Design an enzyme around this catalytic site. Structure first.
Site, mmCIF file in Angstrom:
data_model
loop_
_atom_site.group_PDB
_atom_site.id
_atom_site.type_symbol
_atom_site.label_atom_id
_atom_site.label_comp_id
_atom_site.label_asym_id
_atom_site.label_seq_id
_atom_site.Cartn_x
_atom_site.Cartn_y
_atom_site.Cartn_z
ATOM 1 N N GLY E 204 -8.980 -10.760 -36.105
ATOM 2 C CA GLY E 204 -7.513 -10.988 -36.229
ATOM 3 C C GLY E 204 -7.237 -12.312 -36.882
ATOM 4 O O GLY E 204 -8.087 -13.219 -36.905
ATOM 5 N N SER E 228 -4.123 -8.073 -36.433
ATOM 6 C CA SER E 228 -5.185 -8.243 -35.447
ATOM 7 C C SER E 228 -5.868 -6.915 -35.603
ATOM 8 O O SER E 228 -5.252 -5.900 -35.477
ATOM 9 N N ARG E 229 -7.215 -7.018 -35.723
ATOM 10 C CA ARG E 229 -8.100 -5.945 -35.897
ATOM 11 C C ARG E 229 -8.164 -5.046 -34.686
ATOM 12 O O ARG E 229 -8.465 -3.875 -34.873
ATOM 13 N N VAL E 230 -8.079 -5.630 -33.461
ATOM 14 C CA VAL E 230 -8.256 -4.929 -32.180
ATOM 15 C C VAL E 230 -6.968 -4.782 -31.485
ATOM 16 O O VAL E 230 -6.593 -3.669 -31.145
ATOM 17 N N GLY E 231 -6.175 -5.934 -31.453
ATOM 18 C CA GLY E 231 -4.748 -6.013 -31.262
ATOM 19 C C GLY E 231 -4.278 -5.205 -30.120
ATOM 20 O O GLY E 231 -4.585 -5.503 -29.005
#
Lengths: 265, 116, 120, 48, 361, 73, 217, 116
Positions: E204, E228-231
């Site tokens: 992120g 954000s990649r996972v967010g």
């Protein structure tokens, strides 16, 4: 060095693109309205033209030409300046009335003495009856329109909403109506003030028509020009992006080598 | 002006200036157009294009690329050719009548070709 | 037929009867009529198709019957029953002011609009 | 004055129940201001 | 989840536990304010007694002077937050080993908490300065050159530190080391060798913008260029419902804000009105945290266009009034919202009803 | 070659002739404003009287400034 | 295989110095190949050699040069790279009638980096060679083969291969197709029939070039 | 906002906004023109120009530039005079009367001088 100067300039091309996109969109909003307006004005005109033909109206000239107060309409200004220029070869003395800030400059250089009356011109809204009537009212005093045998109007006809042809039409004077048959296939009286009033009313209606037609072409034209600019600036953003990248890569290698010669010695 | 003569120097000043105008405006001509640039400046640009095509001169050992044999033109003859052209006394013929031609006479003679 | 159009909107038509008030008094036209060119003054204008009736309030213009039932009416900004009291009160003040303040003609035209409206 | 100036003033009184639609209201107003001109030479500008 | 007290960060690019994501931004644009708000918000869990929700915060000032830190401590002390915050300091004056070893010392303190089954949170400030210290060491020991004249092996340093920040199994007590590195940019360069390393490693970014700052919006966090990649896998249910909509409304408004004023299409102008009221709502004063029960009502007002029917100037006023109005009438709905963590159809019926009475006054 | 746009004296002046300070008093502001106005002037945008004033004044000066090789005076 | 299907493998030599192969093998790859070519050349016989791609040779040599602490140039390539490119190319030469009339043609094939030709390697090969066979990515893309711009190509003292047949029919079609470039420059020139005739010819001609890959005429 | 006091902070923020709108508008004004700006915008241009020339104060040690001695301006006097411009009550004052001024008293004194 080179790199920052590429970069500062790449942002320039970028920002220019954004502005030309924006411009084209505001043009579209206005263009809708402008067209709406030109149809009612041309529509009134036709009913008049029904009288003029049938009467067989016949017979110096005045030149009126129409621009906004804003530049960058493409080549509307100079096609109009040019078609004005031709009618200075067919009347090498004609009095030019420039309605608008842009056309005013072009003609005034060519002859300062033909330029006699000029206005501040039409705004950032569609031409309107009140304006044309009043300018017409002033026209009578300054230019002494009634002595002239012809008055003439120039504009740009919006052929298509991608095209413009400069076109003209003839505003019939007060002399014309009188001596064209008007007791012969129409019925007027000598106790009518109708010719001296009919002249003025079509001075203003016809002029409203013309103004509307030019203004519509102009707002259509700016959309077209500014679209082609969005693409032109884009082609150049992509070209300066290729330079930007190449330029950063050389700086990195040249930085590296300086350390290496030092370590080594 | 005291070495190669004053006329030569006046011409040379103009040739750098007319061309500097055409270099300034390069962004604006491509993005926009020429009826969107001022009339005096537009003229300078057409004029500078004429100058730029004129540099096209048939050559002896570049005969293959020009496609036309060599041209020896005097310095003294050269001052006159550029001097007139800057005064637009030979702008009334195509901007491609200046392409691959030696002296001034030749510039006139290619327009007569082109018109046909 | 009727061609009648305003600079803000187009609203013109065989229109059976049209009745217009002119410098020639009042004129009413039914089908073909003698061709005259007459200036319309400030006016209450009626257009009828069938026994259905439409009503316009008018600032003046020009009328020309072309001799073939083609009634060219050309006139500026108009509504009559939807043109309707507070405007009459405002027009009365506008009349007052304009006398004291070409200006002589301005004051006269304003008097005609107050008078045309009070008749409605 | 002019006939078209006469008619023009009546129209102004008429867009003034009082009001109509946007095109009426827009259709009277000046965007243009009388720039006096003669000869080149340019006497000061006043409202049309 | 984790609540930072800024409405924008928690909804658009949520925060999680053992979840690291950048706070990479320009110099003195209130980097520290983005971070500080979160520590102050962790005071909320700390006050209670469930110690698997307690993030024991660590702020790690690396190559950052004692003067700057003295504000940092002072501000903590005023808000009573030096009884769980830990501040490991290797200052500008203190030598390159100490600065090199400052993020490694701080994380390790966090490991005791994490292993015993707890959570804790480490805010690194800043890895731009960690790199500088490694450079000083490398060059005097004549280690291999690399990009930009910083060592080539910097990557390995950062990578070792950032992979310990992780959310562990239940076996390891159900705990994590949450992280938030702060990275200092030279006017927004992210193409720079030290930013670039960290950006790939972490999941992120948050990218603050200089323009927003100048435009008087502080925080100057710019949330379009934040991902954000996972967010949102870590996000409160309540906040997901009332601000899914909120992403789509702000997202359109940016692109439609590349059109500038005369007047425009009927459509285009509408989008700006909606975006702008929301943007002023998300302009907040700094060092002011927010509960879950007061973030969730406001965003729903924006989404449902009871806030975007009200003048821009009056937005700031609306916010407190609406909050007070909800506490006086029905603090039951707020407590319910908070503790359930979610909006049910019975709360969503009510929540619209309430906004209406408030908009009326 | 001469350029006056990027020609500065940090400390400030006091070394010229008294007479030359007066005559060139506002010459510095004219030339500095002119550059900005000149840049705008090329887009082809319509320009108001305040802008065209500066553009007419500036241009004339610049032509004064220009010189030819070997004129000590 | 491609050559062996089309019946032609037996009159060609293939030399291989792959990318898995050690840095001196790649370096020495062009110099050795040209030794075989010279043996054909100096029997007065005509020959050809294609060095594909010398830029990857420049890389193979770079590792060696960098470890030998010899100056770096642009893109970290050897300062002494120049000497290699010249020494190799001048072997593939046309010889006098005293020497057998022996040929060995060179058409050195360069692999650009990012299609930029201001790169250290591209300029160094242009300067040795007489002419260019500049190829453009774009003319290849829109289905035209051969994809060569004659606007970017030139031939100096290498220009000869035009006999009477190819003299009459056009005395170089390339100059005329650099007349097309002008008309189509400013078309997108004249509205006059002259430019439109060239435009109409140039368009037809560009369409006519289009060919299918590995099928020659 | 508390260390320099709330009024001060709010005033300096308004200034930062008005100038920033001015700088965003520079682009629009270059191309589009100055009359294709909204009336709110046109007025911000105008106050921003007044503010921009309200940074200009001569110094004693810059009597090698202007030759007009220095000024002393008290902290409260800056806060109050900038505010007045922004509130729209002190847009009766032209740009050149904020050019070359001290404190507040000075700004008033320069309004009179230019009129005569």
């Amino acid at each position: 060095a080179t790199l920052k100067e590429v970069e500062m300039r790449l942002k320039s091309i970028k920002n220019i693109e954004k502005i030309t996109k924006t411009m084209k969109i505001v043009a579209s909003t206005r263009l809708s309205k402008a067209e709406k307006a030109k149809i009612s004005a041309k529509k009134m005109d036709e009913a008049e033209q029904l009288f003029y033909k049938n009467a067989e109206t016949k017979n110096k000239e005045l030149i009126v030409a129409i621009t906004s107060d804003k530049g960058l309409c493409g080549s509307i200004h100079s096609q109009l300046a040019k078609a004005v220029r031709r009618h200075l070869n067919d009347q090498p003395n004609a009095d030019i009335v420039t309605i608008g800030d842009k056309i005013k400059m072009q003609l005034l250089r060519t002859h300062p003495n033909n330029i006699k009356l000029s206005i501040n011109g039409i705004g950032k809204d569609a031409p309107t009856f009140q304006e044309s009537a009043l300018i017409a009212d002033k026209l009578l005093s300054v230019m002494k329109a009634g002595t002239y045998p012809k008055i003439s109007i120039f504009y740009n006809d919006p052929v298509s909403s991608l095209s413009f042809e400069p076109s003209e039409k003839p505003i019939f004077n007060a002399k014309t109506i009188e001596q064209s048959p008007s007791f012969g296939k129409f019925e007027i009286d000598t106790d009518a003030n109708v010719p001296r009033d009919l002249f003025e009313y079509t001075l203003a209606n016809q002029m409203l028509t013309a103004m509307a037609q030019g203004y519509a072409a102009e707002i259509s034209a700016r959309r077209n020009a500014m679209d082609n600019a969005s693409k032109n600036a884009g082609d150049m953003i992509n070209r300066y992006s290729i330079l930007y990248n190449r330029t950063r890569q050389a700086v990195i290698t040249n930085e590296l080598v300086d350390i290496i010669t030092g370590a080594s010695s | 002006a005291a070495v190669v003569g004053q006329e030569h120097y006046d011409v040379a000043s103009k040739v750098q200036e007319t061309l500097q105008t055409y270099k300034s405006l390069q962004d604006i001509i491509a993005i926009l157009g020429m009826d969107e640039l001022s009339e005096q400046d537009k003229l300078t640009v057409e004029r500078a294009r004429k100058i730029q095509r004129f540099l096209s001169q048939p050559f002896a050992v570049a005969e293959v690329f020009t496609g036309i044999p060599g041209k020896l033109v005097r310095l003294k003859d050269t001052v006159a050719s550029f001097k007139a052209v800057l005064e637009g006394k030979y702008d009334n013929i195509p901007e491609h009548a200046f392409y691959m031609v030696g002296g001034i006479e030749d510039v006139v003679a290619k327009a007569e070709k082109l018109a046909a | 037929k009727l061609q009648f159009a305003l600079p803000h909107e187009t609203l013109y038509s065989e229109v059976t009867q049209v009745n217009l008030p002119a410098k020639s008094g009042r004129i009413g036209v039914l089908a073909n009529h003698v061709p005259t060119v007459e200036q319309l003054l400030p006016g209450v204008v009626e257009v009828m198709e069938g026994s259905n009736s439409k009503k316009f309030f008018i600032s003046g213009g020009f009328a020309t019957v072309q001799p073939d039932s083609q009634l060219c009416v050309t006139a500026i900004e108009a509504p009559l029953e939807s043109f309707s009291e507070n405007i009459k009160n405002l027009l009365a003040e506008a009349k007052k002011n304009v006398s004291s303040s070409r200006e002589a003609a301005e004051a006269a035209i304003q008097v005609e609009v107050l008078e045309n409206l009070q008749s409605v | 004055i002019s006939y078209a100036a006469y008619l023009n003033v009546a129209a102004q009184a008429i867009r003034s129940t009082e009001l109509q639609t946007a095109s009426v209201l827009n259709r009277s107003q000046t965007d243009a201001f009388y720039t006096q001109y003669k000869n080149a030479s340019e006497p000061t500008p006043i409202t049309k | 989840p984790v609540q930072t007290g800024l409405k924008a960060v928690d909804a658009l690019v949520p925060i999680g536990r053992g979840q690291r994501e950048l706070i990479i931004g320009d110099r003195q644009t209130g980097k520290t304010a983005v971070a500080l708000d979160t520590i102050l918000n962790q005071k909320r869990w700390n006050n209670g007694s469930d110690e698997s929700k307690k993030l024991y915060c660590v702020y790690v000032a690396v190559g950052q002077k004692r003067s700057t830190v003295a504000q940092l401590v002072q501000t903590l002390e005023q808000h009573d937050a030096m009884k769980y915050s830990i501040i490991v300091a290797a200052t500008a004056s203190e030598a390159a080993p100490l600065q090199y070893l400052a993020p490694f010392t701080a994380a390790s303190i966090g490991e005791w908490f994490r292993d015993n089954g707890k959570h804790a949170l480490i805010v690194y400030d800043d890895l731009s300065k960690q790199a500088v210290a490694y450079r000083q060491l490398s060059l005097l020991l004549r280690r291999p050159p690399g990009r930009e004249a910083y060592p080539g092996d910097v990557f390995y340093l950062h990578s070792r530190l950032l992979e310990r920040a992780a959310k562990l199994s239940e076996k390891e007590g159900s705990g994590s080391l949450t992280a938030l590195p702060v990275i200092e940019t030279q006017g927004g360069d992210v193409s720079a060798y030290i930013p670039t390393n960290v950006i790939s490693i972490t999941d992120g970014q948050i990218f603050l913008e200089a323009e927003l700052f100048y435009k008087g919006i502080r925080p100057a966090i710019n949330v379009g260029l934040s991902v954000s990649r996972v967010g949102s896998a870590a996000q409160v249910k309540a906040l997901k419902q009332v601000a899914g909509s909120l992403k789509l409304f702000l997202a359109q408004y940016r692109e439609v804000a590349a059109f500038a004023q005369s007047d425009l299409d009927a459509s285009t102008k509408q989008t700006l009105v909606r975006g702008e009221r929301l943007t002023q709502l998300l302009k907040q004063n700094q060092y002011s945290p927010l509960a879950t029960e007061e973030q969730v009502p406001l965003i729903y007002a924006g989404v449902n266009g009871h806030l975007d029917g009200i003048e821009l100037s009056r937005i700031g006023e609306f916010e407190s009034s609406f909050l007070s109005y909800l506490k006086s009438n029905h603090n039951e709905l707020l407590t319910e919202i908070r503790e359930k963590g979610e909006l049910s159809k019975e709360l969503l019926a009510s929540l619209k009803s309430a906004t209406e009475s408030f908009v009326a006054t | 070659a001469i350029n006056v746009g990027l020609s500065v004296s940090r400390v400030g002046s006091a070394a010229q002739v008294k007479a030359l300070k007066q005559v060139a008093g506002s010459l510095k502001l004219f030339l500095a404003q002119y550059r900005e106005v000149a840049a705008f002037a090329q887009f082809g945008s319509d320009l108001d009287a305040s802008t065209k004033q500066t553009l007419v004044r500036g241009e004339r000066l610049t032509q004064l400034l220009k010189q030819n090789q070997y004129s000590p005076l």
